[PDB]
């Protein structure tokens, strides 16, 4: 008998493979598993873990977010690496010539990057031109901007969105929401 300090046979709680059955993603994982094992660069380990992520854990990264990242000092010639989708953004009006490595490009995003003079690149092409992740820049999209995150942690005096279908007057704007009607939250 052992007085177990911790719970026995506890899984790590981290994805060790993509949940998907995408064959091209699996052999993308196969490449970077080899790279993260046989190379000491922390870039390969980060990218391999990001390949495992679920759809809400890889939010889309807009070209405007990429352009703002390139505005940083000394980052103008770095290779922007996005483990996910790069979407277009018409809000921005000037885009620089750069190399963006991503899983997916939308039609508008890929057109805009090419029109600026840049180049859209797959993660295997990143591996051939940067095996240890030389001068890269790993970007991530806004994870907590989802609709579901609004309702997370709902409670009194929390300021979170209630789960509700129809919105307006007669829809949860009454007793419990204003001091005139009973109390306020």
């Amino acid at each position: 008998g052992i007085d177990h300090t911790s719970k026995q046979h506890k899984r790590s709680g981290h994805r060790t493979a993509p949940k998907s059955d995408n064959v091209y993603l699996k052999l993308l994982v196969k490449l970077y598993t080899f790279l993260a094992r046989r190379t000491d660069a922390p870039f390969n380990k980060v990218v391999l873990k990001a390949l495992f992520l679920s759809k809400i854990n890889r939010p889309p990264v807009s070209v405007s977010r990429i352009a703002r990242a390139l505005k940083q000092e000394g980052a103008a010639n770095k290779t922007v690496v996005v483990v996910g989708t790069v979407t277009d953004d018409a809000r921005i009006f000037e885009f620089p010539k750069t190399t963006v490595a991503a899983l997916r490009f939308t039609a508008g995003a890929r057109a805009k990057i090419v029109k600026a003079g840049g180049e859209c690149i797959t993660l295997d092409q990143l591996a051939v031109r940067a095996p240890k992740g030389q001068n890269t820049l790993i970007l991530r999209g806004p994870r907590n901007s989802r609709e579901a995150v609004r309702h997370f942690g709902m409670g009194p005096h929390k300021g979170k969105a209630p789960r509700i279908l129809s919105t307006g007057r007669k829809f949860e704007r009454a007793r419990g929401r204003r001091r005139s009607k009973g109390f306020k939250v």
């Binding site: 018409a90 009006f93 709902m154 509700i164 009454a174 007793r175 929401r177």
Partner: protein, 148 residues
């Protein structure tokens, strides 16, 4: 696919995942939204504040078409120009020949002022505009025409 459900996994187990003490019954707490003020009051006050009670004016015979006024922001204003024809206006950003952007045709009622349009004069036709939207448009060198 009923073969992937837990009902197939509960075969051989007496209570089918419902407990021996709880003893899954018809309606132990009521039907529907019963007891929201009496015995579901804590749940209702925690997750649905404002459910009970009345709020302001009634509107007899409301027609949602009266309140039709879709909003277009300034950062999306230039999207109303076709993409091939857009860049040829950014270059030669000149007066006496400026793009007309009829937002009513595109399906918008009011223009707001998110801002940072390029400094290009554009003629903007809309039912309604905001104060800041017109300030930014006229600063860029364009003008707003009101239509109906």
């Amino acid at each position: 696919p009923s073969r992937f459900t837990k009902t197939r996994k509960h075969r051989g187990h007496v209570s089918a995942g419902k407990g021996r003490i709880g003893k899954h019954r018809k309606h132990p707490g009521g039907r529907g939204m019963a007891g929201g003020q009496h015995h579901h009051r804590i749940n209702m006050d925690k997750y649905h504040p404002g459910y009970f009670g009345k709020v302001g004016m009634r509107y007899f015979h409301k027609q949602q078409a009266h309140f039709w006024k879709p909003v277009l922001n300034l950062d999306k204003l230039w999207t109303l120009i076709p993409e091939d024809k857009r860049d040829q206006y950014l270059k030669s950003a000149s007066k006496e020949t400026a793009p007309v952007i009829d937002t009513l045709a595109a399906g918008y009622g009011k223009i707001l002022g998110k801002g940072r349009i390029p400094n290009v004069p554009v003629i903007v036709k809309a039912r309604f505009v905001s104060k800041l939207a017109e300030e930014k448009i006229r600063a860029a060198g364009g003008v707003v025409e009101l239509i109906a």
